């Protein structure tokens, strides 16, 4: 033996790598919209209960799929008109259920679409299509 020593060693590598983009598949995009809440308007005259907007609850898995989707296209049924397309608009990213504590999630503001100012009926036909940056629409909510 010879030249025995004890030395301090210093090295600070933290991550050395970053995650990929990992664009979601269609099935993941559809499952990201499985849980939802409907924002309703109830001004009491005779059970009005008209729709104001649509939430999409955030989970522990759907973050990257929800932030991948904007430009929701809606086909709803108006009070006087029938079932018709009402255009395409960007999302809004509001707090979930209006709670100051809950995080911000995708919000579809149905009052800003191409309605003639008419309310959108409840328990009628209602279709919402998520539009990807790849210009392909996927039906993510069906109410009949």
């Amino acid at each position: 033996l010879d030249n025995l020593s004890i030395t301090e060693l210093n090295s600070t590598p933290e991550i050395l790598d970053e995650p990929e983009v990992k664009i979601p598949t269609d099935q993941e995009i559809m499952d990201a919209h499985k849980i939802y809440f409907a924002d309703l308007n109830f001004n009491p005259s005779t059970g009005n209960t008209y729709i104001n907007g649509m939430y999409f609850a955030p989970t522990q898995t759907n973050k990257e799929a929800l932030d991948y989707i904007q430009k929701y296209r809606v086909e709803a049924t108006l009070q006087y008109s029938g079932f018709k397309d009402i255009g395409t608009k960007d999302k809004e990213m509001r707090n979930y259920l209006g709670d100051p504590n809950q995080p911000k999630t995708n919000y579809v503001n149905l009052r800003s679409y191409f309605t003639g100012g008419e309310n959108i009926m409840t328990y009628k036909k209602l279709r919402i299509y998520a539009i990807t940056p790849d210009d392909r629409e996927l039906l993510v909510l069906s109410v009949d």
């Binding site: 932030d67 904007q70 430009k71 960007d90 999302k91 809004e92 990213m93």
Partner: protein
């Protein structure tokens, strides 16, 4: 080393960079801001 921050537009670095309400709403919809370099100013070295 971490990238340097650019968050002032005035000559003395005292005024932040603002955006409108509609531009903020566009940012909330997932749109991204790009950065384009148009020109660079710099010096070279000689011998006096």
């Amino acid at each position: 080393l971490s990238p340097l921050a650019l968050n002032t537009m005035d000559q003395f670095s005292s005024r932040l960079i603002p955006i409108n309400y509609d531009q903020l709403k566009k940012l909330d919809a997932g749109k991204q801001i790009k950065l384009e370099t148009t020109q660079v100013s710099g010096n070279f070295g000689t011998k006096n």
